[PDB]
Design a protein around this ligand. Structure first.
Ligand SMILES: [Zn+2]
Ligand SMILES: [Zn+2]
Lengths: 49, 66, 61
């Protein structure tokens, strides 16, 4: 969970070579779904990021 | 705790750099952002670990076991 | 007598509207709403609906 009440669990795991990746190669640690944003109204999470 | 080995994101070895990053802030009086730059960590996934790791190991170490 | 007749007839709350949705039965845009949340905290408000072209009620999630 975050510091904003976004509790959740791990669905599955991936390695880097099929994790998505950005131009500098910063491969992310973890990906959460966008739909947890609007209905939860958790703006400060985004601001923190 | 020690510095981690091996940044979780990227994989570059970190841990050689720790005491260097310390003495960059002890006598060289240097700003820390430039300290990491001069240490040579230009991606930021690597940069977060040195900048946020806390060293509890010596606070452990000040006991007297055996 | 005029003041008495005015005081006889009572509450007339009037249901402020918008024009975005259409009626579930009449299918016209005179729609009025409300907000509050009913169920537990994990979900948003209820988005109550109240048509005024015919008086219909429905709801959106
Ligand atoms: Zn890294
Ligand atoms: Zn209607």
């Amino acid at each position: 969970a975050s510091r904003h009440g976004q509790k959740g669990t791990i669905g599955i795991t991936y390695r880097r070579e099929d994790m998505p990746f950005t131009a500098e190669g910063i491969v992310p640690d973890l990906i959460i779904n966008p739909h947890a944003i609007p209905s939860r109204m958790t703006v400060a999470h985004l601001i923190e990021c | 705790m020690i510095v981690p080995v091996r940044c979780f994101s990227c994989g570059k070895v970190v841990g050689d750099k720790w005491e260097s990053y310390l003495n960059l802030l002890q006598e060289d009086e240097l700003d820390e952002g430039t300290a990491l730059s001069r240490l040579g960590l230009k991606r930021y996934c690597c940069r977060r670990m040195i900048l946020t790791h806390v060293d509890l190991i010596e606070k452990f170490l000040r006991y007297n076991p055996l | 007598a005029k003041q008495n007749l005015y005081n006889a007839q009572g509450a007339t709350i009037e249901r402020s509207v918008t024009d975005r949705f259409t009626c579930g039965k009449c299918k016209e845009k005179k729609v009025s709403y409300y907000q509050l949340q009913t169920r537990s905290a994990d979900e948003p408000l209820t988005t109550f609906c109240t048509c005024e072209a015919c008086g219909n009620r429905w709801k959106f999630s």
